[PDB]
Symmetry: D2
Subunit: 267 residues, 4 copies
């Protein structure tokens, strides 16, 4: 039981192939008691989350919604019972309009689209942290989902910029979480065949974008000194759990790369 | 004449202690023919720029204004004469509301303020590039002003996040500028006593923020193996010119640190 | 039992305050079966290791000795019984002569001293890996001890250069270990009061070096968003175990920072 | 005249396609007065250097030779005349035995070979700096040749480790050079078809190594947002001159990438 009797909030589930779905599964397998947040299609998320090895309360959270955020702590302690706190929080949320990643030239994304992408993808990590730290235990852990934005890449465009912003927000959240005895870190994952990701390689964001994404994926397994399996999200789920646990107690403001080692190799 | 007969657009002048003012001075000293852009207080900027060693046309540019951006190329070629192009472009523009840097806790900046800061500070680098590349010569150079956001720092808060976003935008602008034979790079400067910067250390953004900024400055000269003089912007002006020149012809998507070497030293 | 029934070789124990001593303790607490290697003072190491919560075979290993290395795999399988393999290997060995760190100006270390330091500190990670991979199980883990050498620092001098070399050797060991299903990673620790470290702050390597080391230590806890306790090596021991476990299965060629988050913060 | 009346020592010329040959040519084209150092085949180097646009004294320097180093300052001031100092120093020297790069598995390089490689490739930067700083002017510049070792790469093996060591040595040389008003920096170049480099792609270090090097080269021009021409060393020569000049006066302990921007792009 890596996570025995820890209370952990997990966001961002939308299908059975969401990274957050696998994080939640492995975390329960490891003894965690979960609270889940969902966006928009709540009856759908309910139905999907019913397949986790245990039951967990579902709460609505639109990360762009001030009221959702203001009432969040209240609604969580209500779901976990008064006088209980969280030990962990998982941010697994990402969004960039059409316009900002894919077929569209980089120069043609209007700022409103880019601003929305950054709001949901980078800023919400801070506002989740702000809403949840008052109800977190010493020794607690905040983990967010990242990918390595340190070099530019085709197709991902403004989404990459959003991750650069996220990494930076993470170092600041760490300063705040520290006052609570709480850690803040990101997991940088390699590419994973979620529903949306597979749609994009199928050409949902245009044919040039699809081809480039596919090249990025093939290259990944080659560079990774231990290989990369894009259809298996469990290696990244385990990494997040490692961070939710007591076994990385001196790591914060930081990034753990669950990417097969690909980023450490040129080719 | 490092910049002999180069045509260079320089933005962001607001006083005689603006980094852009010194960039513009040194660039003219080096034979450049300049076009200048100003924001908001145009009669003021006119008056300040009159003190440059040579005269240069002033054009209004509010980086958040679509019409300003759409007409920019037209207005520049008009100022430099039909059939002439630019060889260089300097982005020296930065903004973050009150709310996002200083006394305000990091968690208390509303996204609208952060979004405005990012719009002006990071996104505008791309939209300047988009508006100006059609009128840039092969061998040309785009340079933007940066500071090292790779570690978190007190007081700068959301402005730091904005620079992380900027560095990332720069790597993408480089992909686009490359198609024109144009380079894109950032200069990461150490702290400089501009008017605004001195106001902030005087306590304009609160007393805690002021004290922290001052500590950051004193530390800078100590770490810098060659020292740092915060009241002298000419070392950074020279660095930008180095980048506008033909002497860094294989550098792009990159960051040159005009910071005294401070970032290469722990203490 | 994080490490239940894993067989792990641990090197570098010399006193009850060695990082390797604490790694070994926590690993046994977590169900690991250990084999230990010692250098030079073998009766001493025997006596110290007798205090671990369980017994473990001790083997002599002078990392500079070809015969020691050539016979190592033979001697390990002999200690763990034919047909058994290792699941983990810990490199916790460091050395730099007098000459290369401390009072001595950086320019005054002769290459023979620097070469010895690099041999023991960086190269031996590769030669340990070479000697032990033939007897390692798929899913296995090699972990070495590091400190962040990415910026220069007073006093550590050539030892810092040695760590830069080590980080680089680690990325290459990862390519080799990968063929065996084995991971290779480094843990970058903050400063720890080992016997040798305390001697140096007591002025063993001169008074200027001592003063600088002490300043480095005080700064550490201040920058660390979760604090740093230099007299407690257990947070780093736990981190190494995290890496020896199955919970970071997609991390290799990489560095995990068990440093309180200090490296992610400027001040 | 970028380098008008500067006195610059340039090392590492061996043929008309050496990077140092092109550095020396461009530097003279730019008004520099040069002193040259050569290793081993002195009559050969004499003959090659006769083709530079101006004449320059040749001095023997075996970077591994203590007597050569001890007498170096004496012999330089003798060549440039008493009461004159150097303004610049170029380290353009690299070596790794057979054994440490190429066909040989990474694990099969004996430490003596690796130690020699590191001695010549990394350590000599410090010992050149030590020998020459006493005869350098305030405002002076030390520049060494580098390639980006931050990720592992096939074939280069121990040579990559040597560059990691070099980058680290550079940050320490910067601390020492600073006391003299002198800068220390590295230029990280993309691959260049020197005589030795072409021999290696011809299969001098075995067929697997040759094939991998060739793949590395083709990838380079693709990633570089401005392209890369491996048979043209002048873009890197210009970059070194930029660093020898007064136009990067606040950069030290640092690395300038003359690599086409390749390192800033994933693909
Ligand atoms: N799928 C992947 O391959 C990865 C996901 N991640 C991150 O992990 C997280 C998991 O993403 P996932 O792929 O599972 O799903 P998602 O679609 O990004 O996010 C889940 C939900 O969050 C949802 N969401 C959107 N807006 C909001 C909102 N306002 N509030 C709350 N949730 C929201 C979003 O809305 P939807 O598309 O359904 O309309 C989804 O419902 C995201 O942060 C990803 O950015 C990181 C690396 C990889 C990756 O993209 C990558 C990229 C480049 N190189 C290597 C790896
Ligand atoms: N002053 C400094 O110390 C530095 C400036 N820079 C960058 O260089 C540039 C020069 O800034 P400067 O300090 O000279 O002035 P500024 O106030 O940031 O920008 C100039 C003008 O741009 C203006 N501007 C604002 N909004 C717009 C707009 N919408 N369109 C066009 N211009 C605009 C802005 O508006 P204003 O305050 O007057 O209302 C100013 O008029 C900015 O990018 C800075 O971010 C980078 C490093 C340092 C620095 O902040 C630092 C920080 C931490 N560590 C080390 C160094
Ligand atoms: N003590 C510390 O604070 C740290 C240790 N490490 C690493 O962890 C490891 C643990 O070191 P420790 O401090 O526990 O002991 P050690 O003395 O470095 O090494 C253990 C033994 O290895 C021994 N050893 C030496 N030569 C050999 C040899 N040839 N073969 C096998 N073992 C050898 C060495 O020999 P000895 O001094 O006894 O003569 C020791 O017996 C070493 O790699 C350290 O470099 C990393 C970060 C920190 C650190 O130095 C630091 C520095 C700067 N900033 C932040 C942190
Ligand atoms: N040729 C290249 O493509 C590059 C050279 N450099 C560096 O620039 C410098 C120029 O190297 P060049 O290729 O011109 O020649 P070299 O053979 O490395 O060095 C010149 C001489 O130095 C010489 N030398 C050797 N030992 C000594 C010695 N003991 N004392 C003085 N000089 C010595 C050496 O000896 P030799 O082979 O002739 O026996 C040569 O005579 C070296 O530091 C290179 O490491 C850096 C990046 C690239 C590069 O290798 C690369 C690699 C991977 N990715 C991107 C780029």
């Amino acid at each position: 039981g890596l996570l025995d009797g820890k209370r952990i909030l997990v966001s961002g589930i939308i299908t059975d192939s969401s990274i957050a779905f696998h994080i939640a599964r492995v975390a329960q397998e490891q003894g965690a008691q979960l609270v889940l947040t969902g966006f928009d299609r709540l009856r759908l998320i309910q139905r999907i989350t019913d397949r986790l090895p245990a039951k967990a309360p579902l709460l609505e959270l639109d990360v762009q919604n001030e009221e959702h955020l203001a009432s969040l702590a209240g609604r969580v302690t209500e779901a976990i019972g008064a006088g209980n706190k969280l030990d962990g929080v998982v941010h697994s949320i990402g969004f960039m309009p059409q316009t900002g990643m894919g077929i569209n030239p980089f120069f043609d994304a209007p700022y409103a689209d880019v601003s929305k992408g950054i709001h949901i993808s980078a800023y919400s990590y801070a506002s989740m942290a702000k809403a949840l730290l008052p109800i977190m235990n010493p020794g607690g852990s905040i983990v967010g989902m990242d990918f390595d934005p340190s070099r530019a890449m085709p197709a991902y465009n403004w989404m990459t910029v959003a991750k650069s912003a996220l990494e930076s927000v993470n170092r600041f959240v760490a300063r705040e979480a520290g006052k609570y005895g709480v850690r803040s870190n990101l997991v940088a994952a390699g590419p994973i065949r979620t529903l949306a990701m597979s749609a994009i390689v199928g050409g949902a964001l245009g044919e040039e974008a699809g081809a480039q994404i596919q090249l990025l994926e093939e290259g990944w397994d080659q560079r990774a000194p231990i290989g990369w399996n894009m259809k298996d999200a469990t290696p990244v789920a385990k990494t997040v759990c490692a961070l939710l646990s007591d076994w990385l107690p001196a790591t914060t403001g930081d990034i753990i790369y669950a990417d097969g080692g690909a980023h450490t190799q040129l080719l």
